[PDB]
């Protein structure tokens, strides 16, 4: 698939961002809009492409038929706290390979879109990653998984410690893996990494991060594995490795 | 002092944000705008209030005469990386006590202003902190100091570890202490904490964080000390303590 679905996704992404931007208007039970958004998006594509499959929130089991990997609201915590960093992400795959991705920054109203072989764009502007190969001039982004047990957050702190020790020019934790991947998608950041993020968070962000220079691999260096809750994206393969090589396998799924 | 200076600060903050928003337009030597901004701001107030003193970037030595504590650009790193989170902060003090504060989010165009006894406002909207007393429902913000030696970033990771362990509902690192303090200033965040941040970073943010419920104290619980590169702000005295009590003295100045 191509064009028709891509346009449908954009329009849904936008309509969605609106309902969630609006939902943010006033004063933990607003996990209803999440549904409403996912409900809006899916009930419509499921009615326009009846043969398609849908992946959202074991479950993630990607087939060869065109499937939509959707994250109605990335950053619920931000949302529940009205911290203006939340998104809607719609990625589309066919033949078990990511075709396009659409990500809307609801409050800032930034629409990141990337179609394979067609490049990446954020509100009309064509995104290009940075060329940053030196991990000492890198601006690394990350997210603290959903866990909290002393064991998992032992390698978390240490892993961040390694990057910091690595003389890392700076690390940011914005609470929205998708939007963080979108910063890397543009000049904004030089690399992202994490464990515990699901397939619907990197589905769309990867088509973009790729269509704009960038590289998305496994926390091992190996090829990207949607099923494994782990990823490492960066401006260049150089950086993509120094980060991965310096990481330490934690365990999510 | 009061009114006249406050208006002058707003206008300078705005004009400043513009030059820096504009400076962000295109493709590490743009540490000139920093000067230009600080130069603009100071050369004008120093010409409108000749008897005033100015504090900016030992140095911080606050007197009883009206002095301006200025941070021309908070978040140079973000700036150097075009990560859309950078600010201009202008705080004003008289009688060794903070009178008002003005903070401009250059890209988002958000103008946080707070005058003691007159409350806090962000673009006309009146800010109020959250009521969050439970550290398990808190959204904590922080910043990694400018250091990197293994010792200082031993308590950093551990201190964050303690909050996380404390079952902290979430932690964010946006690279802009002022703007983070402004999120806490509004509903956005429930608490902030850090070591290694200078007096010009919390000068203005404190008048605001206070004029909106909020509390700003020392990482010890004691009263706020501008001179010490350390602060702990929060929605309520409850939270303000759990955070402080669980911290571990690091050392900056």
From Swiss-Prot, chains A, B:
Residues engaged in binding Mg(2+) 2: 71, 74, 201
Residues bound to substrate: 57, 73-76, 175-177, 194, 201
Enzymatic reactions: a myo-inositol phosphate + H2O = myo-inositol + phosphate; 1D-myo-inositol 1-phosphate + H2O = myo-inositol + phosphate; 1D-myo-inositol 2-phosphate + H2O = myo-inositol + phosphate; 1D-myo-inositol 3-phosphate + H2O = myo-inositol + phosphate
Organism in which the protein naturally occurs: Homo sapiens (Human)
Similarity comment text for this entry: Belongs to the inositol monophosphatase superfamily.
Chain positions recorded as Mg(2+) 1 binding sites: 57, 71, 73
UniProt cross-references to CDD domains, sorted A to Z: IMPase
Activity vs pH: Optimum pH is 7.5-8.0.
UniProt keyword list: Cytoplasm, Hydrolase, Magnesium, Metal-binding
Protein name: Inositol monophosphatase 2
GO annotation, cellular component aspect: cytoplasm; cytosol
Involved pathway(s): Polyol metabolism; myo-inositol biosynthesis; myo-inositol from D-glucose 6-phosphate: step 2/2
InterPro entries according to UniProt: IMPase, Inositol_monoP_metal-BS, Inositol_monoPase_Li-sen, Inositol_monophosphatase-like, Inositol_monophosphatase_CS
Molecular functions per Gene Ontology: glucose-1-phosphatase activity; glycerol-2-phosphatase activity; inositol monophosphate 1-phosphatase activity; inositol monophosphate 3-phosphatase activity; inositol monophosphate 4-phosphatase activity; metal ion binding; protein homodimerization activity
Assembly and binders: Homodimer.
Annotated localization: Cytoplasm
A Pfam family that the UniProt record links to this protein: Inositol_P
Enzyme class: hydrolase
Cofactor(s) in the UniProt record: Mg(2+)
EC number: 3.1.3.25
Gene (name only): IMPA2
Function: Phosphatase that can use myo-inositol monophosphates, myo-inositol 1,4-diphosphate, scyllo-inositol-1,4-diphosphate, glucose-1-phosphate, beta-glycerophosphate and 2'-AMP as substrates in vitro. It is likely that IMPA2 has an as yet unidentified in vivo substrate(s). Has been implicated as the pharmacological target for lithium (Li(+)) action in brain.
Description of how activity is regulated: Inhibited by high Li(+) and restricted Mg(2+) concentrations.
Keyword Mitochondrion annotated: no
Induction: Repressed by Li(+).
GO biological process, one term: response to lithium ion
Coarse class of the protein's main subcellular location: cytoplasm
